[PDB]
């Protein structure tokens, strides 16, 4: 855990080949470069994955809403976007308890 003030952003526009939808999202560099980011398209209601660190849905057993109930984002409707740079405890336990 540590804190820092050299957290920029930058926005990226990808083209949705599910229904062939282009939009452009802005995201934390840092979550980005060093972490997960999901961004949701406005055309098919979905959030896709662009750049994953974190390995969070890489587990096969967290939901995108689990993702949101650990950082506070009550809204959904909201921005469709959300930025990880560091993942929780209570998460990654779910995850690393099968084996020990
Ligand atoms: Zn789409």
């Known amino acids: 855990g540590s804190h820092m003030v050299d957290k920029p952003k930058m926005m990226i526009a990808f083209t ?29 209601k979905v959030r896709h994955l662009i750049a994953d660190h974190l390995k969070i849905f890489h587990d096969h057993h967290v939901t995108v809403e689990q993702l949101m109930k650990a950082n506070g984002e009550q809204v959904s409707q909201d921005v469709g976007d959300l930025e ?3 993942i929780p405890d209570s998460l990654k336990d779910v995850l690393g308890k099968y084996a020990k």
């Open 16 to 44: 949705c080949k599910k229904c062939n939808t282009r939009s452009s999202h802005t995201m934390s560099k840092q979550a980005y470069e060093k972490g997960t980011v999901l961004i949701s398209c406005p055309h098919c």
């Open 84 to 86: 990880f740079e560091d």
